[PDB]
Amino acid sequence: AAALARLGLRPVKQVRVQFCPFEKNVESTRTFLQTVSSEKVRSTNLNCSVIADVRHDGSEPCVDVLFGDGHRLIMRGAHLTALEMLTAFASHIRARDAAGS
Amino acid sequence: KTSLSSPPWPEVVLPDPVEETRHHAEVVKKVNEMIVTGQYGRLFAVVHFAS
Amino acid sequence: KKSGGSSKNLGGKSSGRR
Amino acid sequence: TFRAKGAAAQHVNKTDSAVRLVHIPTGLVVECQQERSQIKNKEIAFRVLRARLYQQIIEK
Amino acid sequence: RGRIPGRQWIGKHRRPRFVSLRAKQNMIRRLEIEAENHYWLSM
Amino acid sequence: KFTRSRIPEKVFQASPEDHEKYGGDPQNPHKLHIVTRIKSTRRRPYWEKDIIKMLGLEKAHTPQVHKNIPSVNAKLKVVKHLIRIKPLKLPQGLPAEENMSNTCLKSTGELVVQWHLKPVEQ
Amino acid sequence: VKTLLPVPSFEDVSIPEKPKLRFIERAPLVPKVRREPKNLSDIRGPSTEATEFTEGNFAILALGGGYLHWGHFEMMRLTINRSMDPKNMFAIWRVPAPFKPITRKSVGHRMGGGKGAIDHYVTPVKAGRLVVEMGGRCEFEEVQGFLDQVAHKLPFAAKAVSRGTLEKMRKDQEERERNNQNPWTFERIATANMLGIRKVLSPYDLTHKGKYWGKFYMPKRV
Amino acid sequence: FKNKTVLKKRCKDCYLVKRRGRWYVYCKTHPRHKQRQM
Amino acid sequence: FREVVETQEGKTTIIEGRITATPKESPNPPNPSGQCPICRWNLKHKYNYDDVLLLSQFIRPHGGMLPRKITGLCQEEHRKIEECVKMAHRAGLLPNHRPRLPEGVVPKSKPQLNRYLTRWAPGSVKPIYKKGPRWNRVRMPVGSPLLRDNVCYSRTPWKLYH
Amino acid sequence: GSKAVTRHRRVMHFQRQKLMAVTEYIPPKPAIHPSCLP
RNA sequence: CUCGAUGUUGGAUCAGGACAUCCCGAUGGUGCAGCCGCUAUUAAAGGUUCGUUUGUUCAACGAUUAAAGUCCUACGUGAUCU
RNA sequence: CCCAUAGUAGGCCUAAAAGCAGCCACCAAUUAAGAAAGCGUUCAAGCUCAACACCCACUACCUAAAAAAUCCCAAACAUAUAA
Ligand SMILES: [K+]
Ligand SMILES: [K+]
Ligand SMILES: [K+]
Ligand SMILES: [K+]
Ligand SMILES: [K+]
Ligand SMILES: [K+]
Ligand SMILES: [Mg+2]
Ligand SMILES: [Mg+2]
Ligand SMILES: [Mg+2]
Ligand SMILES: [Mg+2]
Ligand SMILES: [Mg+2]
Ligand SMILES: [Mg+2]
Ligand SMILES: [Mg+2]
Ligand SMILES: [Mg+2]
Ligand SMILES: [Mg+2]
Ligand SMILES: [Mg+2]
Ligand SMILES: [Mg+2]
Ligand SMILES: [Mg+2]
Ligand SMILES: [Mg+2]
Ligand SMILES: [Mg+2]
Ligand SMILES: [Mg+2]
Ligand SMILES: [Mg+2]
Ligand SMILES: [Mg+2]
Ligand SMILES: [Mg+2]
Ligand SMILES: [Mg+2]
Ligand SMILES: [Mg+2]
Ligand SMILES: [Mg+2]
Ligand SMILES: [Mg+2]
Ligand SMILES: [Mg+2]
Ligand SMILES: [Mg+2]
Ligand SMILES: [Mg+2]
Ligand SMILES: [Mg+2]
Ligand SMILES: [Zn+2]
């Protein structure tokens, strides 16, 4: 949370978190949701919408990130850790911000 | 198998004493037959004299 | 070279009485 | 510490007996070379320096 | 450049001397001999 | 000051573990000693030099036999660091008049009354 | 759920009216006129006095011999008083005021001409003697912060100890001697005059047993 | 940098790192905290 | 093991993780009661820096060391293997575990100095200009002190300082 | 020479120095390290 | 150690070396804006003034200089000189 | 690593003392957080620690350097059964 708050969510338009809470491979996705849903992270950009979708379809968890430039970032947490997804999410922010400005 | 798993020196297997005792008798008899037939030339000896 | 002091203890040179 | 002045044979030519004391805040310079020993000179040089600076503080 | 002040093996400052492996073994060997002498003087 | 050393009597009290190590029998103490000097008397105090002369240990590595009595042991305790003490063994008993000239003292401390200089037939 | 543990209560511990260390003078009330010999044996060997706690629970343990002059006492008094809490801590002196006269000749004087005049006084301290003892409504961690600071400023090796740490230190040493696998020990060889070793040893080595060398104490010797 | 025999971190941002065979103290927040092992 | 693949299709970045084949321990260890892999196979005090077959099982593909928690090694053997891996890298015994290089970067030519039992990094050791007296000689360390307890088949113990 | 008690660590006699080395403490060594047993 | 002799200040001449660096080089920190400084790491290749008084080493003073370094060399060197 | 609301700026003293100049108390809301352990503010703000939650960070709690003046100074070696 602290590391992600420093970078901010300026180039991020919408963050969608999809996971099935009754499955055994959604712990990493839920941990990612907790970091993003933090007050410090959300306070960086009030125009960025964080949406948590809870489904019972048995599908693997997925995280969809939409930037202002229109590019989409999709990280599938079925076999990824929370730290890895955060680092990939942070790297895209540091790159999409430079392209826009 | 590593570098220190086994001693560097190769393993040595001594001959069977039961078999080697028969082998020693053959060698002694062979040398003894040479003395009987005189199959030797000049002889050198090491003697202990005067300390 | 500085001039030093002197010992103020005198006597005490008696030999042993055996 | 520096070599003294005077008709004193070989001892001065090698021994830095004279002592010069400079008080940095006031700039007073005190030199003493009466005694052969530097420590003896240093103590008296201090004593003259103390006396001279005693007047200076009175003047101060 | 490394010199011992004064003589080497005498004085306040001396050249350090270190006990080798065989020096210890020789002392232990003589200690064992004297230990057996203690036993034979006990009877 | 460097003076003579008083050895506590506890040093010369053999424990049961010591008997097993050296093989001695406390109930049957050895009658005689085999004293051999293995250390020089030089760089030792004069009273140690004198006792070595009294025990006939002037020449090193020369075995000497002494009686196992408290008075002799008292001298040995002074110079115990200069000597090797071993018990004298008599596998065939004391030498007799017939075999006086055929005796030899082996390195094991045994005095053999017969010395043929021949290999054993066994 | 984090597991909590009970804490000790100090409500039964009383605090004296003068928790701070008392002032220590350079010289006794009556100056001494009979000059004393050097007597280096007063700082040689283990200490036979002030080796146990009296009132406090924490103290500074002396790990070697040395002399304490008035400069050291001021260092101990100022640091301890400043770094202590008088309401919950108290400190006492386990060493006497400087009493042993020390003579210094005039600078530049050649050898001879008697003995020099008395210059200052020192307190001889042997190894294993408590110097300053503290206690009260506090833990060892609270006082260990500055006691170790004072300990490293002493002329001899020192370390802050408590009633538990000192007992552990002594019991650990006894365990080391018990399970020592070395068949040869300094005590056995020296007392029995093995190898004639007493020709190079000291008569004090019969009781020091190799643990003490001059004014130095070696805790690793068994 | 200041040569030191005992290295101590003067704040939370200091970190110990062993470089060129000796230990160093680096602090981006307070550069004066930088120390070098002597 | 597990791998991470990043694909960009239609200006959209997709990050996925997949499980690859995972090697398993050889069956029936000689010492099942051992608490760490080294002593379960009776390999304690019986390996050196050049036993790369053992060392390669505890390193990353780029030569980095693996965590002690993941490998399950004890603290003592983890440090022994870590130092042995460093000496193996400096000795050139692991040519397939070179550090990762970014695209467009080609290392320049450097002098080739054959070395082994290299305790310290070559770029951080100062020359011994003054050897010193025989009683205070400055020695050149060889090997690592952590390998002092290795089984020595010679009467002379390992000389860790030359 | 120096006195019995000195400010510095006085150099021991070689005979005494060999005695100190021989009589060092040797901790017991277990046949199997405790960390290798359950 | 040397008295059946190992010749003393300072200067002249020629300098050898150490770095605990005065100047020039490369760096860290600063109560480093810049210009000047302070402090620390590294560096001994090169350089380190001319004069009045004093036998002087020093010191004071004049005019300069990027700087007018600290020490060792039988207080470097008198079968080279004064 | 993560995280921090509130009776209340406790009373007294004090121009002002608000957890953090002194003195007294040190109770209590919330599942969870000291009438405050370290910084800071003229006083307040502000940054941490001790809380909860998450979770097997499943830590060592034994230590410390260097400089001289002709030119470093045996050469070398971690591996074959202790003599
Ligand atoms: K000497
Ligand atoms: K000290
Ligand atoms: K002469
Ligand atoms: K120069
Ligand atoms: K003139
Ligand atoms: K206040
Ligand atoms: Mg008398
Ligand atoms: Mg008389
Ligand atoms: Mg009479
Ligand atoms: Mg005259
Ligand atoms: Mg005259
Ligand atoms: Mg000499
Ligand atoms: Mg190492
Ligand atoms: Mg004496
Ligand atoms: Mg002549
Ligand atoms: Mg000249
Ligand atoms: Mg020159
Ligand atoms: Mg330098
Ligand atoms: Mg240098
Ligand atoms: Mg230049
Ligand atoms: Mg700068
Ligand atoms: Mg000269
Ligand atoms: Mg000449
Ligand atoms: Mg001249
Ligand atoms: Mg409150
Ligand atoms: Mg208040
Ligand atoms: Mg305040
Ligand atoms: Mg309070
Ligand atoms: Mg606040
Ligand atoms: Mg906390
Ligand atoms: Mg050479
Ligand atoms: Mg040779
Ligand atoms: Zn810092």
Side-chain angles (χ1 to χ4, degrees):
Chain A
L4 187 58
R6 303 169 186 172
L7 184 53
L9 294 179
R10 303 181 183 273
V12 186
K13 176 183 177 181
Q14 174 191 351
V15 174
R16 189 180 65 87
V17 181
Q18 169 187 0
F19 62 93
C20 303
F22 290 87
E23 298 292 338
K24 299 184 180 183
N25 57 335
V26 300
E27 179 179 354
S28 302
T29 305
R30 290 189 54 178
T31 306
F32 180 85
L33 177 60
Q34 185 72 18
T35 300
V36 177
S37 62
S38 179
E39 180 65 28
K40 302 178 301 183
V41 182
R42 295 181 293 99
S43 59
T44 60
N45 182 21
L46 298 183
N47 300 332
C48 177
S49 303
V50 178
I51 309 299
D53 292 355
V54 169
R55 304 179 183 180
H56 197 39
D57 312 325
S59 62
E60 296 183 359
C62 170
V63 177
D64 198 330
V65 174
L66 180 64
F67 295 89
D69 302 328
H71 296 269
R72 295 177 53 184
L73 175 55
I74 293 180
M75 297 175 299
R76 312 189 186 277
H79 302 81
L80 292 180
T81 67
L83 182 60
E84 291 174 4
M85 296 184 296
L86 285 173
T87 298
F89 177 65
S91 297
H92 283 50
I93 295 181
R94 196 176 297 102
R96 295 306 177 185
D97 190 13
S101 60
Chain B
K1 182 178 182 180
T2 58
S3 58
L4 302 182
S5 63
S6 64
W9 53 83
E11 296 181 358
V12 169
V13 177
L14 294 179
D16 193 22
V18 180
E19 179 186 3
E20 190 177 3
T21 302
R22 302 196 306 265
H23 179 54
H24 286 184
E26 301 178 1
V27 178
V28 173
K29 180 178 297 180
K30 181 192 306 178
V31 176
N32 182 81
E33 288 177 348
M34 300 180 60
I35 306 179
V36 178
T37 54
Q39 293 184 3
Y40 54 87
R42 180 172 293 269
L43 295 171
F44 70 95
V46 178
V47 298
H48 177 281
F49 197 92
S51 72
Chain C
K1 177 61 181 300
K2 302 176 185 296
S3 58
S6 57
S7 180
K8 295 300 179 181
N9 302 328
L10 302 183
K13 303 183 182 181
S14 310
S15 301
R17 295 181 299 270
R18 275 74 178 178
Chain D
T1 59
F2 66 102
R3 309 181 191 195
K5 316 178 68 179
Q10 300 184 1
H11 208 2
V12 159
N13 311 326
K14 19 223 128 190
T15 299
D16 302 359
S17 55
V19 181
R20 174 182 291 101
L21 300 181
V22 178
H23 188 258
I24 307 178
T26 57
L28 295 186
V29 177
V30 178
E31 306 179 8
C32 178
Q33 62 178 10
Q34 182 176 356
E35 282 64 63
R36 321 162 76 104
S37 169
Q38 156 177 149
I39 307 171
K40 226 166 183 178
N41 289 318
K42 181 180 182 181
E43 291 177 357
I44 294 197
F46 262 94
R47 186 182 302 179
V48 181
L49 182 58
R50 294 155 193 175
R52 292 180 176 184
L53 284 173
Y54 176 75
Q55 175 65 23
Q56 182 271 352
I57 290 193
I58 293 186
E59 293 169 355
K60 162 193 176 181
Chain E
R1 46 180 292 274
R3 53 177 296 274
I4 293 299
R7 204 174 173 94
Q8 304 178 59
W9 301 112
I10 65 178
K12 182 178 184 180
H13 300 274
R14 303 182 179 184
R15 171 186 175 186
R17 182 75 159 94
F18 310 105
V19 190
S20 56
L21 181 58
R22 63 180 172 184
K24 303 177 184 181
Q25 298 178 356
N26 299 339
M27 171 164 288
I28 297 175
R29 189 175 300 105
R30 292 187 177 272
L31 284 172
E32 296 177 356
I33 298 177
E34 189 163 1
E36 188 168 355
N37 292 341
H38 290 175
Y39 179 78
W40 295 121
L41 295 178
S42 304
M43 301 175 298
Chain F
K1 302 179 183 181
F2 171 73
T3 58
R4 297 178 182 81
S5 301
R6 283 174 50 90
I7 318 297
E9 293 185 359
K10 189 183 179 181
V11 177
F12 304 98
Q13 294 178 356
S15 59
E17 302 181 3
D18 295 328
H19 296 293
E20 300 180 356
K21 182 177 183 178
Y22 303 110
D25 192 3
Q27 300 183 2
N28 301 327
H30 58 107
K31 183 175 299 182
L32 303 179
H33 291 289
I34 297 182
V35 189
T36 298
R37 184 177 68 87
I38 62 177
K39 198 65 168 53
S40 182
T41 58
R42 299 301 297 181
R43 307 175 182 274
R44 297 306 302 177
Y46 64 94
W47 58 77
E48 296 184 3
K49 295 188 179 64
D50 298 336
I51 292 186
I52 290 297
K53 301 182 57 181
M54 300 171 182
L55 298 171
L57 301 173
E58 292 276 41
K59 180 179 298 181
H61 312 299
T62 299
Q64 179 77 350
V65 51
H66 286 284
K67 297 179 299 195
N68 187 22
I69 56 180
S71 59
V72 169
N73 294 337
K75 292 183 178 56
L76 298 179
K77 293 177 182 180
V78 185
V79 294
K80 58 184 181 60
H81 53 277
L82 306 174
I83 60 182
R84 165 185 282 107
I85 304 177
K86 304 295 296 182
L88 175 58
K89 300 179 181 179
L90 298 169
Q92 296 88 14
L94 286 172
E97 179 66 25
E98 296 181 354
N99 54 16
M100 273 300 184
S101 303
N102 303 328
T103 55
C104 178
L105 179 66
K106 293 182 178 179
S107 60
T108 57
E110 297 179 349
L111 175 64
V112 290
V113 301
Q114 292 181 359
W115 194 241
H116 305 93
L117 296 168
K118 299 173 183 177
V120 295
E121 298 182 7
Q122 297 179 355
Chain G
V1 182
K2 180 174 297 181
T3 62
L4 302 177
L5 298 179
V7 298
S9 61
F10 302 106
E11 61 177 359
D12 301 356
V13 180
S14 180
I15 299 300
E17 303 168 356
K18 297 183 178 182
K20 293 183 178 300
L21 286 174
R22 67 173 188 179
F23 177 79
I24 296 295
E25 301 176 351
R26 303 171 172 267
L29 303 181
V30 40
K32 310 182 67 175
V33 298
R34 174 71 176 278
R35 291 171 294 187
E36 301 180 357
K38 191 155 299 179
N39 188 25
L40 290 180
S41 64
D42 58 355
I43 63 175
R44 183 181 181 184
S47 184
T48 56
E49 48 179 347
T51 56
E52 301 291 341
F53 295 89
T54 55
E55 298 183 342
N57 306 320
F58 325 107
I60 297 181
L61 177 66
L63 293 178
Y67 293 111
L68 298 176
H69 55 81
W70 188 76
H72 297 138
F73 283 91
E74 291 298 320
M75 178 271 307
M76 296 186 288
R77 184 183 65 90
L78 292 176
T79 307
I80 289 180
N81 288 333
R82 177 179 64 260
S83 304
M84 70 181 299
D85 187 12
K87 297 183 178 182
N88 304 271
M89 308 180 183
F90 67 94
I92 62 176
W93 292 107
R94 296 300 300 275
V95 294
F99 60 94
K100 177 179 177 180
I102 298 298
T103 60
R104 289 287 180 272
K105 273 183 169 299
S106 302
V107 193
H109 281 199
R110 289 187 169 179
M111 305 297 102
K115 189 181 181 64
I118 298 182
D119 193 9
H120 57 271
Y121 299 88
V122 295
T123 299
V125 172
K126 289 179 178 293
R129 174 191 176 99
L130 303 181
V131 177
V132 180
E133 184 172 352
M134 300 188 61
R137 311 170 188 174
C138 58
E139 303 285 348
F140 178 53
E141 183 176 355
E142 308 178 21
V143 297
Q144 194 184 16
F146 55 88
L147 286 183
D148 279 327
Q149 168 184 350
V150 178
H152 288 62
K153 287 187 174 180
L154 297 179
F156 44 83
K159 180 176 58 179
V161 296
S162 59
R163 287 183 173 270
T165 54
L166 183 56
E167 184 69 21
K168 177 180 180 179
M169 182 192 310
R170 298 180 179 178
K171 283 304 177 183
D172 195 8
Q173 171 62 29
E174 298 178 350
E175 184 183 7
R176 288 172 53 93
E177 306 178 12
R178 180 182 54 83
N179 56 22
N180 182 24
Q181 299 295 335
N182 200 334
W184 308 109
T185 59
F186 196 101
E187 176 187 358
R188 174 191 179 185
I189 300 180
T191 53
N193 194 18
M194 306 184 66
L195 309 176
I197 195 63
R198 298 181 59 173
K199 188 171 179 296
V200 309
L201 298 184
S202 174
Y204 291 89
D205 296 328
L206 303 180
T207 58
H208 295 175
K209 303 175 183 178
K211 305 176 181 300
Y212 298 87
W213 174 242
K215 69 167 180 179
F216 301 102
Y217 164 67
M218 307 171 181
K220 293 189 175 183
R221 295 293 302 182
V222 303
Chain H
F1 279 110
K2 295 294 301 299
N3 288 23
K4 292 291 181 180
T5 310
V6 181
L7 300 184
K8 296 181 174 181
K9 302 186 304 175
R10 297 175 57 177
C11 73
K12 58 180 180 181
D13 295 320
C14 298
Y15 55 95
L16 288 172
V17 60
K18 196 177 193 182
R19 300 175 182 174
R20 294 168 293 272
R22 62 178 63 186
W23 284 93
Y24 287 94
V25 186
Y26 284 91
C27 176
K28 298 182 181 180
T29 306
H30 304 280
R32 61 178 61 185
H33 295 174
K34 294 168 62 176
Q35 305 173 19
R36 177 191 298 102
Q37 179 183 7
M38 191 176 185
Chain I
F1 294 93
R2 185 172 58 88
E3 298 183 3
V4 180
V5 284
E6 313 186 3
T7 171
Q8 299 182 359
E9 299 177 2
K11 301 183 179 183
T12 296
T13 307
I14 299 181
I15 318 295
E16 297 184 357
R18 59 182 185 91
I19 301 298
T20 61
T22 303
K24 303 175 181 298
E25 184 178 9
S26 295
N28 309 322
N31 182 26
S33 57
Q35 302 300 303
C36 106
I38 293 304
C39 65
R40 287 202 302 263
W41 295 87
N42 302 324
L43 283 179
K44 191 180 184 62
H45 309 299
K46 294 185 181 64
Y47 63 90
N48 207 335
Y49 79 106
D50 54 333
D51 298 317
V52 293
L53 292 179
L54 164 58
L55 302 180
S56 62
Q57 301 181 1
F58 302 100
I59 58 178
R60 298 180 179 271
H62 291 293
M65 194 66 181
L66 279 177
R68 186 175 64 90
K69 178 182 180 180
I70 301 302
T71 58
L73 299 173
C74 55
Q75 187 179 10
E76 180 173 5
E77 290 300 323
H78 177 76
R79 292 177 175 175
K80 291 185 181 181
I81 297 185
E82 181 181 6
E83 297 294 333
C84 288
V85 168
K86 298 181 185 179
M87 291 185 291
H89 280 295
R90 297 159 183 164
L93 298 187
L94 300 178
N96 298 327
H97 300 258
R98 299 310 299 169
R100 180 175 182 179
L101 293 174
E103 303 181 359
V105 173
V106 178
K108 61 184 178 183
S109 62
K110 297 176 180 57
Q112 300 181 353
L113 300 175
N114 300 330
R115 63 176 71 259
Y116 58 95
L117 293 169
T118 306
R119 180 184 304 183
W120 293 331
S124 65
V125 194
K126 290 303 173 184
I128 304 179
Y129 285 140
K130 305 172 182 178
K131 299 180 181 177
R134 303 185 175 184
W135 41 272
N136 200 15
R137 182 63 53 87
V138 184
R139 295 297 183 180
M140 297 180 297
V142 174
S144 186
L146 305 182
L147 300 180
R148 181 183 288 103
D149 295 328
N150 287 19
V151 172
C152 183
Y153 301 94
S154 61
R155 297 300 179 179
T156 304
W158 310 91
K159 292 190 60 179
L160 302 176
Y161 300 90
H162 287 186
Chain J
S2 304
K3 289 185 172 176
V5 175
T6 56
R7 304 184 186 275
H8 69 285
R9 295 184 178 268
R10 186 159 60 95
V11 180
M12 298 181 180
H13 190 264
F14 187 58
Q15 286 284 349
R16 182 191 177 101
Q17 188 176 353
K18 296 186 300 181
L19 181 67
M20 304 290 289
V22 170
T23 59
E24 291 177 351
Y25 168 73
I26 300 178
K29 178 183 179 182
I32 304 180
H33 192 272
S35 299
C36 296
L37 298 179

